[PDB]
Design a protein around this ligand. Structure first.
Ligand SMILES: [Ca+2]
Ligand SMILES: [Ca+2]
Ligand SMILES: [Cl-]
Ligand SMILES: [Zn+2]
Ligand SMILES: [Zn+2]
Lengths: 164, 4
């Protein structure tokens, strides 16, 4: 079933900040904001962890769209291959979630990678979830239109943070 | 992709 990261890195503070730093041409800004909040609350509502949205500076969870190299030693690679990636909880790049601007992203109303599912998967990583062996799990390693966290996803996050 |  679920994986965490080696040594179970987790947020140590009651409150974790997150910033949507950069946006996609594919969607309105507010749509990315509301889908990220939704992706975070899907994990959030299961655990004793609270997210505060910040609109400037460095937050614990830096979220954005990037083309190619974007300062974290894991450059994006243009259309296809890598779609997105994220870092386990930690200082600096820890917690950060990046989306490759050279794919196509949708809110579900158009063609594209479903951004809500993608953001739920990457922010799983941001909170300390590894890849699940369970195909139903959002944290399954391969890529959505109508979904929720699986019982494996809930089990894993609650094992790392506790319930409620 | 999950990195450290
Ligand atoms: Ca960070
Ligand atoms: Ca790519
Ligand atoms: Cl399930
Ligand atoms: Zn990156
Ligand atoms: Zn992943």
């Amino acid at each position: 079933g679920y994986s965490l990261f080696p040594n179970s890195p987790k947020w140590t503070s009651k409150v974790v900040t997150y910033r949507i730093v950069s946006y996609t041409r594919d969607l309105p800004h507010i749509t990315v904001d509301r889908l990220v909040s939704k992706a975070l609350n899907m994990w959030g509502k299961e655990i004793p962890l609270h997210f505060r949205k910040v609109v400037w500076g460095t937050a614990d969870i830096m979220i954005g769209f990037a083309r190619g190299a974007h300062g974290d030693s894991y450059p994006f690679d243009g259309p296809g291959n890598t779609l997105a990636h994220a870092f386990a909880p930690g200082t600096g790049l820890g917690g950060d979630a990046h989306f490759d601007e050279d794919e196509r992203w949708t809110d579900g109303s158009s063609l594209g990678i479903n951004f809500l599912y993608a953001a739920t998967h990457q922010l799983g990583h941001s909170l300390g979830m590894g890849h699940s062996s369970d195909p139903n799990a959002v944290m399954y390693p391969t890529y959505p239109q109508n979904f929720k966290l699986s019982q494996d996803d809930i089990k894993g996050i609650q094992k790392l943070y506790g319930k409620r | 992709x999950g990195a450290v």
